[PDB]
Amino acid sequence: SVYDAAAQLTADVKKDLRDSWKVIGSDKKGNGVALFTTLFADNQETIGYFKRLGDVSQGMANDKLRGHSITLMYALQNFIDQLDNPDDLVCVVEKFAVNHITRKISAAEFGKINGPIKKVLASKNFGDKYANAWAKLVAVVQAAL
Template sequence: MLNIFSLFNDCPETVAYFKRLGDIKQGKNNDKLRGHSITLMYALQNFVDHLDSPADLICVVEKFAVNHINRKISAAEFGKINGPMKKVLASLNFGDRYANAWAKLVAVVQAAL
């Protein structure tokens, strides 16, 4: 959940997109936020699992995009996660290679949005 708090620190206006999750400042004590984090981990695993099947990967990405479209998240708004994620990855001693891979994944979702 470190990345979501980095997002909120870097782009405070994004807090409004997570209102349905309640008080996000509760962190791990917020069941809805924890559930969202778990769902995100499953989505990332789903992306990785389908890298060898472009047709299936497109379906997975489109479903992920629809979830964000339904919440009125634009491609530009979705891309705001890149800066905070780069900071998180750097704090965990992951280099630019990982940040670039993350940005490519975000770009694919943005294209679907």
């Protein structure tokens, strides 16, 4: 359950999420676009869900892709800001899941974002410890799908 998954966010996991977000969230446009372009590069099968975005290979030059990428980063900002209160984190995650459930995005499908997150983290000198912390946060969302 989402309530059980949220309880897995221990003290050090929360701390590692904040420390890495301080850097990653500093450039939402740049890191947001890097995150999603990596998703399409490593998992081309997911491109089908983004027909509305057009030619995603254009990257930053694609206004729709840039708009989506910047916006995605504010969902992550929301999650990080709610780490202090489990009740608020859960209600924001459930709210976030609504549209993804309607698009038939499964937990397994959503989990494909872990790879891209690990790579972006590594590009900023944040290793496995941080990738694992982020996988824990992603797992809270997966529990809601």
